Design an enzyme around this catalytic site. Structure first.
Site, mmCIF file in Angstrom:
data_model
loop_
_atom_site.group_PDB
_atom_site.id
_atom_site.type_symbol
_atom_site.label_atom_id
_atom_site.label_comp_id
_atom_site.label_asym_id
_atom_site.label_seq_id
_atom_site.Cartn_x
_atom_site.Cartn_y
_atom_site.Cartn_z
ATOM 1 N N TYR A 1 -11.087 -3.090 2.751
ATOM 2 C CA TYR A 1 -10.304 -2.460 3.814
ATOM 3 C C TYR A 1 -11.139 -2.477 5.089
ATOM 4 O O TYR A 1 -12.104 -1.721 5.215
ATOM 5 C CB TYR A 1 -9.879 -1.047 3.437
ATOM 6 C CG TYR A 1 -8.760 -0.528 4.316
ATOM 7 C CD1 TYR A 1 -8.959 -0.327 5.677
ATOM 8 C CD2 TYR A 1 -7.500 -0.250 3.790
ATOM 9 C CE1 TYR A 1 -7.942 0.145 6.491
ATOM 10 C CE2 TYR A 1 -6.477 0.226 4.601
ATOM 11 C CZ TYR A 1 -6.709 0.415 5.951
ATOM 12 O OH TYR A 1 -5.710 0.882 6.768
ATOM 13 N N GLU B 1 0.869 -1.169 0.000
ATOM 14 C CA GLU B 1 0.000 0.000 0.000
ATOM 15 C C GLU B 1 0.907 1.221 0.000
ATOM 16 O O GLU B 1 1.823 1.317 0.825
ATOM 17 C CB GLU B 1 -0.931 0.013 1.214
ATOM 18 C CG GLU B 1 -2.030 -1.030 1.152
ATOM 19 C CD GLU B 1 -2.947 -0.819 -0.032
ATOM 20 O OE1 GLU B 1 -3.181 0.356 -0.402
ATOM 21 O OE2 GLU B 1 -3.416 -1.823 -0.608
ATOM 22 N N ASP C 1 -4.934 10.847 8.479
ATOM 23 C CA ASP C 1 -3.649 10.401 9.001
ATOM 24 C C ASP C 1 -3.278 11.144 10.276
ATOM 25 O O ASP C 1 -3.558 12.339 10.419
ATOM 26 C CB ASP C 1 -2.552 10.606 7.957
ATOM 27 C CG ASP C 1 -2.598 9.561 6.882
ATOM 28 O OD1 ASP C 1 -2.554 8.368 7.240
ATOM 29 O OD2 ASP C 1 -2.709 9.929 5.693
HETATM 30 O O1 LIG Z 1 -0.768 3.768 10.134
HETATM 31 P P1 LIG Z 1 -1.704 2.657 10.568
HETATM 32 O O2 LIG Z 1 -2.337 2.983 11.892
HETATM 33 O O3 LIG Z 1 -0.912 1.350 10.612
HETATM 34 O O4 LIG Z 1 -2.850 2.505 9.477
HETATM 35 C C1 LIG Z 1 -2.564 1.934 8.213
HETATM 36 C C2 LIG Z 1 -2.562 3.052 7.181
HETATM 37 O O5 LIG Z 1 -1.422 3.880 7.366
HETATM 38 C C3 LIG Z 1 -2.508 2.500 5.760
HETATM 39 O O6 LIG Z 1 -3.813 2.195 5.334
#
Ligand SMILES: O=P(O)(O)OC[C@@H](O)CO
Ligand SMILES: Cc1[nH+]cc(COP(=O)(O)O)c(/C=[NH+]/[C-](C[C@]2(O)C(=O)Nc3ccccc32)C(=O)O)c1[O-]
Ligand SMILES: Cc1[nH+]cc(COP(=O)(O)O)c(/C=[NH+]/[C-](C[C@]2(O)C(=O)Nc3ccccc32)C(=O)O)c1[O-]
Ligand SMILES: O=P(O)(O)OC[C@@H](O)CO
Ligand code: NA
Ligand code: NA
Lengths: 396, 267, 396, 267
Positions: free
Chosen positions: D174, D48, D59
């Site tokens: 997801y 990813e 985020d």
């Molecule tokens: O950063 P975390 O909490 O691992 O979440 C996953 C995300 O960053 C990618 O889909």
């Protein structure tokens, strides 16, 4: 010789240098004429409604009274344009000044609220405004000073005496005694020589008139008591006036206790001074044994005056009104309580009145009583004062 | 009485009166007494004397600072009356007038204040913040204790006021040079002939012009316009203020100024 | 699936992470239900009247228009409790939050006005309030920060990005995405995901409703144009809404031009950006060629946002409303002019709207026109910003 | 296609998938490429990959700072696509999924964005701020260009949402561990068995659980609960952030972490 009685019992009069008597007589005459003039009343009313924002709300406070039998309303002069009740009478006095052909305005101020009001009325109505302010107040109130100056007023620091309100009062009257032909003295309280105590009351009495109508509409009866702080007497007499003949309605005025009456650092002449002659009037004063005028003290620069208007002295002497005092710390607690529990930041002046109401509730929590506090202004101007106190006390 | 005797003698000599003002106890009690003796020895015809007051609303910065100096020396009204008694003991005939603020007269009883004035030999009292309209208990107490109540004739006086000041006043009439507060730098230039003539028509006490009189030419102008004399305060007090560190030069400069001002009063 | 249309033409929608869709749907449902509930409407009305001070005055300005054929009224939202129009919708949103069983409030703020409003409503109505504010705004707005804290709100500086409003917006939405079960997001403007643009308009539309009634009473006709500043769109849509179907009434929105559109340092996405997807909505954005969101700039922290609500984007696209821009210097001149000639200190945000009105008058001084400016708040909060500018420019 | 092949192979081996996330170009283009090769060599089953965006509203601080580091190196979306092409040239079978914010997909045309994805060999795209309700033009463009549109099953999903994600999604589903934003320190502990079972009942693409997965035990728990695999981002990015000054130790610590997380996916 006057058209109206200059005395309230023993208190009042016109104790000014002879040079100023014609100015006082002209002002009285202009006021009597204006009060009978429907065009003047219509213009005053229009400014009060459409410029200043009258009528002001009467707010029921349903968090601070929880668990008691007190119902508490606040009369919201803090919502008037300018942030306090002072705007009512400056509009009327400015119209009187124009009626008399005066082009300039002299005004005193303590914390700056009457200064701001005088400046804004002068800007609207085309008058040249100069404001005397104690230098200690100037240093501590630079925001309100800049507001006055933004509105075109000249602000003159006064470094004499205690450099607070009394000293600004002195300088304003010295100025007027050499400029009365062109300047109107826009005295900021219901004190000084006749006709000011009468004029200021009549241009503030809409406070109580509205309060009476609003309380009748909401509660179907008159208040048990109306409560207002007293520095010179304007906001309190504006609330009291329309209730004086309603004998069941208590009238409670709150002087500043400062650091405590027993310290001598307070502003409570009505109950803790004695009658003297100063600032144009015979009135209770803080004074030495010799008759020198003492300096007052209060956390609130708007209550920092060592005398009081004569009508309050009279209403007290006959028992129609009762006067009490509230200390700095009591006022601070009321300020914090209103901010946190009603979302209203009150002036430190008005916080004295609220503090006494809270005491009336807390001391007898099962006493059924309907109270109105005159919330004479908002406390935005006071946040720096409160911050520094809470910082020094370790609270923040 | 002392004013009537003075004005009669001055009229025989075709002289106007020169009347200095100082604040009692400025810069201290002993120097204030020496000052006053110098003013008399230099030609003062009468005295006007202030009692220090916390809030003198009729005075500009010069006399405000005189009061502050007096207070800094601890001067009280009681001490001022002790001075007044000493001054009278030395000078039995000079008229002595007080310039007072109302609270100091009212504080412990109007009657008692005028009784003390009489005890020490004061001849007149002017209360700066008591207009004719409020004067009744003051003028009654003054007359009861053989004190002349002094009233102000301002430049904006109307005829009724002229007739009141003429009827109620004694000793002298205080003819204001101008509006405003005391101040040597602010000289009044409005002609006062009309007011001087009305006062005389109404049999008022002789007029002494005051406020802004700081030069001999102003003294001559007042007498020439018909006034019985002239009062000078701030100009005198500035000489004190200027020489605080040189007490001897202070007295010498005071003598020179007073002598010149009095010379200008002679016709 | 929604009860109400989430789009205004191409603009609007619900571009949030999937986790937040149930919160948005619940809010929409609660709003639709509340709007039909006479008890909710009565409580909202009571707070607006007796706590906030509605109706607000409509003030005719008879000094600034002298010598021209412009008649100018100001709608006095500066007289509302708290000092700006924000108080209207926070009261409604807080009641919605209680209706939904939420105990906490999240809010963003720029200069602090929505923060103060959110804090005061939460104090009155018993909600736990936390406010995100760009750290640069915190540093420059310590007074409003202390006011929020006096009223019991938690104020959280945001140091990311430009450390201004957009960044506070981001953090508030991040917070909500992990706290929606207990917290209502009290979004401060008519933007973001559906249903916020609709809810904010409906809880601000009393501005235009009152204005219409007041102008009809005083002038006997509708305005030629109503003029409001546009940062996110709340005050402008509150004024515009009731006039949209009055086709003769011009609707003029004023975006910040900052240092000049040509400098790129401005906040005028509606006319100088392009459509993008951000902050939960499809709306005009300031963005790079690559699609990164640009930082905005304005002297006024309340207009410092690089997007705009979708209904304004729509009203512009169809020509019903016209949008213009006003620079920092133009806003400053309007601020000074109102202080000195009407005795009203306006917010720097509202000064943009006044500046455009003054331009409409000055450019065509013989054009007969009846204009209303929405004076969305008072400028007490801005006196330090103005002081430092006038000091740096040598004017004081 | 690559996801179907991967999940078939993993099911034959009774293995879950371990899918790391990094931001493309963090801390620079060349180190980012070496990072990604290390993640693959250490056992990553799929990737990813984030494209740096100015305002990543889904985020937490860890990945916010990854974007900032990338921007500090001048990384643009165009450069990210050049990287994606190079990665695919080296690794022909590993599934490559993008995590995008909507404006970067919409900016210059939804269709064109997915056309570029196909050109470089991307297998799937998840748009973090486009819910199913708004997804129509995105999922149509994805399918037109042989890209799997990825949809999120949040823990508060209702049955209608489950049926929509199952119908409209491809490649993988997801499965969110928890509410909130990305963050290795915030571990989701709500049991997800029910959602995993409904997705399977509705024939959804195999579920990869993401958000808060930072330890091997969490990877084993996800697979044991029925998920097809687990995604870990912030935990990976912290290893980058910690070793910015030691690029070699960064790769060694990444290999160790990835190897351990992948080991926990084996049943
Ligand atoms: O950063 P975390 O909490 O691992 O979440 C996953 C995300 O960053 C990618 O889909
Ligand atoms: C919000 C508020 N509430 C109550 C008061 C109390 O005054 P009152 O006793 O009601 O008259 C407020 C005071 N304002 C004034 C002070 C002033 O009023 C004035 O101007 N001259 C003057 C002279 C003597 C006494 C008092 C005053 C200021 O400007 O500092 C105030 O600001
Ligand atoms: C007096 C006054 N007048 C006009 C405005 C303009 O805002 P609008 O365009 O009308 O919505 C005022 C601004 N207030 C806000 C900003 C805020 O509104 C908010 O809170 N979140 C948010 C998000 C995006 C854009 C704008 C906002 C603040 O607190 O800084 C203001 O204070
Ligand atoms: O100070 P001046 O201006 O001389 O006025 C006289 C006065 O001080 C005494 O009556
Ligand atoms: Na007082
Ligand atoms: Na904007």
């Amino acid at each position: 010789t006057t058209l109206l009685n200059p005395y309230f019992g023993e208190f009042g009069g016109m104790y000014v240098p002879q040079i100023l008597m014609p100015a006082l007589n002209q002002l009285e005459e202009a006021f009597v004429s204006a009060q009978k003039d429907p065009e003047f009343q219509a213009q005053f009313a229009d400014l009060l409604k459409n410029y200043a924002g009258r009528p002001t709300a009467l707010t029921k406070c349903q968090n601070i009274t929880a668990g008691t039998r007190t119902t508490l309303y606040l009369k919201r002069e803090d919502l008037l344009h300018g942030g306090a009740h002072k705007t009512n009478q400056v509009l009327g006095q400015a119209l009187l000044a124009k009626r008399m052909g005066k082009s300039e305005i002299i005004a005193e101020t303590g914390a700056g609220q009457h200064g701001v009001a005088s400046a804004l009325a002068s800007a609207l109505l085309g008058l040249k405004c100069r404001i005397y302010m104690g230098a200690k107040d100037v240093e501590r109130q630079s925001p309100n000073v800049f507001r006055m100056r933004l509105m075109g007023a000249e602000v003159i620091p006064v470094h004499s005496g205690s450099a607070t309100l009394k000293d600004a009062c002195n300088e304003a009257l010295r100025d007027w005694s050499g400029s009365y032909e062109t300047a109107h003295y826009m005295l900021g309280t219901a004190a000084g020589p006749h006709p000011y105590p009468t004029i200021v009351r009549e241009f503030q009495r809409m406070i109580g008139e509205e309060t009476k109508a609003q309380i009748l509409d909401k509660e179907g009866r008159l208040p048990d008591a109306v409560i207002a702080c007293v520095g010179g007497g304007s906001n309190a007499i504006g609330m009291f006036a329309d209730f004086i003949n309603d004998t069941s309605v208590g009238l409670i005025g709150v002087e500043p206790g400062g650091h405590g009456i027993e310290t001598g650092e307070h502003g409570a002449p009505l109950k803790h001074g004695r009658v003297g002659i100063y600032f144009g009037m015979k009135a209770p004063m803080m004074q030495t044994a010799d008759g020198q005028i003492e300096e007052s003290y209060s956390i609130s620069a708007g209550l920092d005056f060592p005398s009081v208007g004569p009508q309050h002295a009279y209403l007290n002497s006959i028992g129609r009104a009762d006067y009490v005092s509230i200390t700095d710390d009591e006022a601070l607690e009321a300020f914090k309580t209103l901010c946190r529990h009603e979302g209203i930041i009150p002036a430190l002046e008005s916080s004295h009145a609220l503090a006494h109401a809270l005491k009336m509730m807390r001391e007898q929590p099962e006493k059924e009583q309907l109270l109105v506090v005159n919330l004479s202004g908002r406390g935005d101007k006071d946040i720096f004062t409160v911050h520094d106190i809470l910082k020094a006390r370790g609270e923040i | 009485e002392r004013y009537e005797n003075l004005f009669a003698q001055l009229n025989d000599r075709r002289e106007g009166a020169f009347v200095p003002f100082v604040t009692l106890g400025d810069p201290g009690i002993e120097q204030s007494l020496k000052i006053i003796d110098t003013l008399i020895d230099a030609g003062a015809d009468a005295l006007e004397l202030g009692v220090p007051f916390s809030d003198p609303l009729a005075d500009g910065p010069t006399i405000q600072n005189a009061n502050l100096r007096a207070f800094a020396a601890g001067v009280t009204p009681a001490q001022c009356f002790e001075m007044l008694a000493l001054i009278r003991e030395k000078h039995p005939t000079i008229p002595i007038g007080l310039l007072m603020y109302a609270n100091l007269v009212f504080n412990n009883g109007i009657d008692a204040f005028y009784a003390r004035c009489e005890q020490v030999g004061v001849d007149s009292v002017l209360v700066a913040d008591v207009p004719v309209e409020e004067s009744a208990p003051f003028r009654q107490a003054a007359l009861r204790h053989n004190i002349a109540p002094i009233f102000i004739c301002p430049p904006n006086a109307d005829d009724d006021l002229l007739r009141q000041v003429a009827s109620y006043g004694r000793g002298y009439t205080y003819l204001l040079s101008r509006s405003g507060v005391t101040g040597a730098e602010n000289r009044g230039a409005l002609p006062l002939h009309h007011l001087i003539e009305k006062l005389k028509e109404y049999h008022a006490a002789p007029a002494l012009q005051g406020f802004g009189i700081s030069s001999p030419e102003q003294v001559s102008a007042a007498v020439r316009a018909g006034a019985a004399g002239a009062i000078s305060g701030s100009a005198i007090v500035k000489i004190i203020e200027k020489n605080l560190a040189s007490p001897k030069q202070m007295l010498a400069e005071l003598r020179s100024f007073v002598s010149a001002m009095k010379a200008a009063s002679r016709a």
